[PDB]
Amino acid sequence: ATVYRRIPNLPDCDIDNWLNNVSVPSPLNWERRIFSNCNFNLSTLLRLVHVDSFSCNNLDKSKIFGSCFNSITVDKFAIPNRRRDDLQLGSSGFLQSSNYKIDISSSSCQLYYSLPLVNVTINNFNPSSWNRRYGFGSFNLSSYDVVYSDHCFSVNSDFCPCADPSVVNSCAKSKPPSAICPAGTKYRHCWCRCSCLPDPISTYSPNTCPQKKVVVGIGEHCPGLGINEEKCGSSCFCSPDAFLGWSFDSCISNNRCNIFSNFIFNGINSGTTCSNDLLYSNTEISTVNYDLYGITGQGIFKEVSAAYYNNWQNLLYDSNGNIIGFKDFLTNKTYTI
Amino acid sequence: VIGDFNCTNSFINDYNKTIPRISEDVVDVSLGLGTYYVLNRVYLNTTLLFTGYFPKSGANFRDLALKGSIYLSTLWYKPPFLSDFNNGIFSKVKNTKLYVNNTLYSEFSTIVIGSVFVNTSYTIVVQPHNGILEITACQYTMCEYPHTVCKSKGSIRNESWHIDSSEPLCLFKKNFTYNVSADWLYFHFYQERGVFYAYYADVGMPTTFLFSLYLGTILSHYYVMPLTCNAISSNTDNETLEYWVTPLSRRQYLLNFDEHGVITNAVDCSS
Numbered sequence: 198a199t200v201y202r203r204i205p206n207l208p209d210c211d212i213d214n215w216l217n218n219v220s221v222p223s224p225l226n227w228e229r230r231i232f233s234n235c236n237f238n239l240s241t242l243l244r245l246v247h248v249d250s251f252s253c254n255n256l257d258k259s260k261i262f263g264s265c266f267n268s269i270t271v272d273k274f275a276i277p278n279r280r281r282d283d284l285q286l287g288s289s290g291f292l293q294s295s296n297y298k299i300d301i302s303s304s305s306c307q308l309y310y311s312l313p314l315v316n317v318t319i320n321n322f323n324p325s326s327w328n329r330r331y332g333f334g335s336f337n338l339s340s341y342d343v344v345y346s347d348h349c350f351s352v353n354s355d356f357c358p359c360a361d362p363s364v365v366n367s368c369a370k371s372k373p374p375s376a377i378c379p380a381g382t383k384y385r386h387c388w389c390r391c392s393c394l395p396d397p398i399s400t401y402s403p404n405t406c407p408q409k410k411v412v413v414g415i416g417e418h419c420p421g422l423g424i425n426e427e428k429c430g431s432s433c434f435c436s437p438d439a440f441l442g443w444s445f446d447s448c449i450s451n452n453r454c455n456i457f458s459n460f461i462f463n464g465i466n467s468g469t470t471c472s473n474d475l476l477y478s479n480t481e482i483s484t485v486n487y488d489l490y491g492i493t494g495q496g497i498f499k500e501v502s503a504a505y506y507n508n509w510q511n512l513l514y515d516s517n518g519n520i521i522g523f524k525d526f527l528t529n530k531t532y533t534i
Numbered sequence: 535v536i537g538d539f540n541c542t543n544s545f546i547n548d549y550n551k552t553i554p555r556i557s558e559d560v561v562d563v564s565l566g567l568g569t570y571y572v573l574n575r576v577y578l579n580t581t582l583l584f585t586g587y588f589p590k591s592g593a594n595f596r597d598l599a600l601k602g603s604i605y606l607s608t609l610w611y612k613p614p615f616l617s618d619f620n621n622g623i624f625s626k627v628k629n630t631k632l633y634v635n636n637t638l639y640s641e642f643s644t645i646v647i648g649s650v651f652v653n654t655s656y657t658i659v660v661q662p663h664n665g666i667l668e669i670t671a672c673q674y675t676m677c678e679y680p681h682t683v684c685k686s687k688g689s690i691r692n693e694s695w696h697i698d699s700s701e702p703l704c705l706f707k708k709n710f711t712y713n714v715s716a717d718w719l720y721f722h723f724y725q726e727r728g729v730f731y732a733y734y735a736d737v738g739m740p741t742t743f744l745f746s747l748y749l750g751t752i753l754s755h756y757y758v759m760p761l762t763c764n765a766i767s768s769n770t771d772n773e774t775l776e777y778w779v780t781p782l783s784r785r786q787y788l789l790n791f792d793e794h795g796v797i798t799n800a801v802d803c804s805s
């Protein structure tokens with residue numbers, strides 16, 4: 198009975214196109230994008246994206262339809278199908294210890310969707326500065342294998358795990374193999390035995406090792422893996438074998454990959470990022486109370502042929518001031534009264 | 535002095551002599567140059583008596599174009615350069631056509647309209663990129679001394695028209711395309727009942743509809759942002775920036791729509 202037509206003022210952000218990118222992130226290097234000042238549709242997102250599981254928390258399912266928001270953050274990463282039971286609301290296992298942390302306070306939704314593995318790739322970049330500083334390369338993994346971690350540590354801006362050769366030669370016994378430490382950083386705290394024995398991952402007492410067991414938080418990334426101090430040795434070029442504390446897992450399920458996505462909405466019932474699901478529901482004009490481009494009225498519609506419309510003129514008005522026709526901006530179908 | 539934010543103070547000086555010229559070209563609206571089409575209406579073989587916002591028939595333009603090479607004076611930002619946006623403005627812009635390596639580039643100034651130019655309020659920015667026009671109505675933080683920087687022949691300064699780490703609360707963002715090899719572009723801007731309406735045209739024809747946005751506030755000041763270029767002068771070429779503007783007022787016009795809808799003859803009720 199009601200035909201609502203109105204051109205949007207803000208463009209579309211294509212959340213589905215960003216979720217279906219050829220470069221799929223990893224549990225460690227989970228990506229995001231601040232979607233704002235756009236319109237999002239739930240039906241198209243659930244249709245195009247192959248939805249497998251969907252839930253929410255601190256908000257109703259029907260509440261998302263129609264409500265406006267200020268910003269949307271989509272924290273996505275490929276599912277490690279091995280550890281799927283770790284993605285629980287309030288978990289502290291292997292997943293939520295060195296990876297993305299689930300939001301509990303604000304309204305947050307969770308989605309688990311499949312994606313074809315054809316011509317797709319998995320990105321496993323390490324978003325750490327002190328890791329890339331001390332000679333970090335890659336992991337040399339195979340296709341369709343995502344990298345995650347459980348233990349996460351941190352160091353200081355002037356901490357050299359690869360000690361200076363002077364400190365190594367000063368301690369005749371219990372000397373750690375290490376090359377020339379670069380400048381601008383203090384050497385490793387160390388016959389003088391050093392700290393963090395036998396490895397920074399597992400220690401007898403955390404007070405004797407300057408690398409403290411750090412955890413993740415809301416939007417916080419792991420500062421880096423547990424790089425072994427006495428396993429490098431070039432100006433402290435660390436071998437890729439000295440980077441421990443990580444793990445790799447496949448994502449093959451019915452010959453397809455799986456990706457989890459956490460949606461965080463900021464600005465409940467505010468902002469301009471509104472959902473056009475409640476208004477744009479029928480979108481089918483039958484040959485009727487209409488609200489077209491702000492003009493409200495009542496009348497019957499018919500299908501005729503017309504070619505006298507420009508690229509900015511949709512409504513047809515007469516010299517008296519009444520509307521007698523219009524053009525649908527979605528199907529180019531001219532409907533006259 | 536348009537906004538309130540410290541942006542830069544390296545090249546800041548004063549001046550004593552800048553007159554904004556007054557073109558001898560009177561406003562001729564008999565051929566349809568000076569009017570605008572309706573928002574989204576189509577007419578065929580009719581005479582529409584439209585009571586809208588139009589410039590004064592047979593008036594003069596005030597050139598608010600400002601160019602610069604090394605320095606810019608604070609007097610350029612003070613009145614009367616910041617004219618009182620009472621009802622609206624009709625602007626004629628000279629499409630600066632530069633030739634670099636036998637290819638063409640289109641350049642002209644940008645427009646910023648705001649009440650107090652504070653991020654707690656809404657301001658509209660119209661920026662011409664190469665072949666594109668970007669319109670953004672956002673809560674931009676306007677710089678103290680904004681200026682547009684050349685991107686086709688280089689500029690010593692850097693472009694500074696807003697400072698925002700994240701995207702502010704925008705109400706309208708859109709892009710349009712225009713012909714790059716044009717001579718004079720025309721623009722119409724006005725406000726009514728808290729709604730801002732804009733129109734544009736590439737050639738000497740009535741301006742086409744751009745957008746209409748509801749704000750609820752009252753716009754106070756419009757500004758044509760100056761341009762900083764290195765090779766636009768008297769030593770490298772002989773063409774400059776000519777931005778003419780005329781104030782709008784509420785008046786009644788008569789437009790003639792032909793069989794197709796093209797405006798042929800428009801008349802004003804002021805003899």
Ligand SMILES: *[C@@H]1O[C@H](CO)[C@@H](O[C@@H]2O[C@H](CO)[C@@H](O[C@@H]3O[C@H](CO)[C@@H](O)[C@H](O)[C@@H]3O)[C@H](O)[C@H]2NC(C)=O)[C@H](O)[C@H]1NC(C)=O
Pocket residue numbers: 538539540652653654675697698
């Ligand atoms: C919205 O606009 C307001 C008004 O400009 C912004 O407040 C201004 O923010 C700047 C940058 O933080 C302040 O500059 C600083 O001033 C202090 C002295 O108070 C100085 O020591 C610093 O070196 C720096 O120059 C400025 O003072 C401040 N204005 C006022 C009146 O306090 C605000 O940041 C803008 N917000 C957004 C989100 O854009």
Ligand SMILES: *[C@@H]1O[C@H](CO)[C@@H](O[C@@H]2O[C@H](CO)[C@@H](O)[C@H](O)[C@H]2NC(C)=O)[C@H](O)[C@H]1NC(C)=O
Pocket residue numbers: 238239240241473474475477478479
């Ligand atoms: C925007 O969201 C609405 C809300 O779901 C969509 O409307 C549904 O469309 C599907 C088919 O596209 C129908 O099967 C449903 O019955 C519609 N919902 C209702 C309540 O009628 C709409 O299609 C979406 N827009 C686009 C372009 O996909």
Ligand SMILES: *[C@@H]1O[C@H](CO)[C@@H](O[C@@H]2O[C@H](CO)[C@@H](O)[C@H](O)[C@H]2NC(C)=O)[C@H](O)[C@H]1NC(C)=O
Pocket residue numbers: 508527528529
């Ligand atoms: C409705 O008609 C317009 C006008 O032809 C179509 O817009 C054109 O779309 C094609 C392909 O997407 C482009 O190559 C043209 O440049 C577009 N022209 C203009 C003027 O925008 C539009 O695609 C049509 N829509 C439907 C659903 O048929």
Ligand SMILES: *[C@@H]1O[C@H](CO)[C@@H](O[C@@H]2O[C@H](CO)[C@@H](O)[C@H](O)[C@H]2NC(C)=O)[C@H](O)[C@H]1NC(C)=O
Pocket residue numbers: 208663666668707708709
């Ligand atoms: C309107 O056009 C401008 C100019 O091309 C677009 O700005 C570009 O945006 C892309 C992607 O964000 C950047 O890679 C370019 O560097 C930008 N160019 C400039 C000159 O800033 C803008 O995105 C367009 N907006 C819309 C809604 O189409």
Ligand SMILES: *[C@@H]1O[C@H](CO)[C@@H](O[C@@H]2O[C@H](CO)[C@@H](O)[C@H](O)[C@H]2NC(C)=O)[C@H](O)[C@H]1NC(C)=O
Pocket residue numbers: 713714715716
């Ligand atoms: C942009 O403007 C130029 C300048 O008028 C247009 O070039 C004209 O094109 C017509 C059509 O063939 C010719 O008859 C004129 O002789 C051309 N004039 C000049 C000075 O070259 C150009 O066509 C316009 N762009 C578009 C897309 O229409």
Ligand SMILES: *[C@@H]1O[C@H](CO)[C@@H](O[C@@H]2O[C@H](CO)[C@@H](O)[C@H](O)[C@H]2NC(C)=O)[C@H](O)[C@H]1NC(C)=O
Pocket residue numbers: 768769770771772
């Ligand atoms: C802009 O036009 C002026 C006027 O013709 C040019 O000035 C002349 O330049 C030629 C060549 O350098 C001299 O021989 C004349 O004596 C100049 N006349 C005057 C009155 O100064 C000027 O060169 C042109 N601009 C450019 C960049 O060529």
Ligand SMILES: CO[C@]1(C(=O)O)C[C@H](O)[C@@H](NC(C)=O)[C@H]([C@H](O)[C@H](O)COC(C)=O)O1
Pocket residue numbers: 547548549552599600601602603604605606607766767768
């Ligand atoms: C020829 O000089 C121009 C130019 O380079 O194109 C032209 C003109 O002299 C002037 N620009 C304006 C709008 O007045 C401008 C200023 O006179 C100078 O650039 C110096 O201006 C200041 C404020 O120092 O210089």
Ligand SMILES: *[C@@H]1O[C@H](CO)[C@@H](O)[C@H](O)[C@H]1NC(C)=O
Pocket residue numbers: 313315316317
């Ligand atoms: C990659 O696979 C997807 C899923 O089948 C498909 O949509 C896309 O077109 C493919 N890309 C190429 C370049 O074949």
Ligand SMILES: *[C@@H]1O[C@H](CO)[C@@H](O)[C@H](O)[C@H]1NC(C)=O
Pocket residue numbers: 337
């Ligand atoms: C990666 O591992 C494969 C396994 O045999 C090996 O052939 C290849 O040389 C390795 N590449 C690097 C850069 O380590």
Ligand SMILES: *[C@@H]1O[C@H](CO)[C@@H](O)[C@H](O)[C@H]1NC(C)=O
Pocket residue numbers: 540541542543
């Ligand atoms: C603006 O900031 C610059 C440094 O970026 C400073 O030199 C200048 O004094 C400031 N202007 C003020 C505070 O008016």
Ligand SMILES: *[C@@H]1O[C@H](CO)[C@@H](O)[C@H](O)[C@H]1NC(C)=O
Pocket residue numbers: 690691692
């Ligand atoms: C413009 O930005 C560049 C990039 O850092 C900088 O090197 C240059 O000094 C800036 N120019 C001015 C005039 O501030």
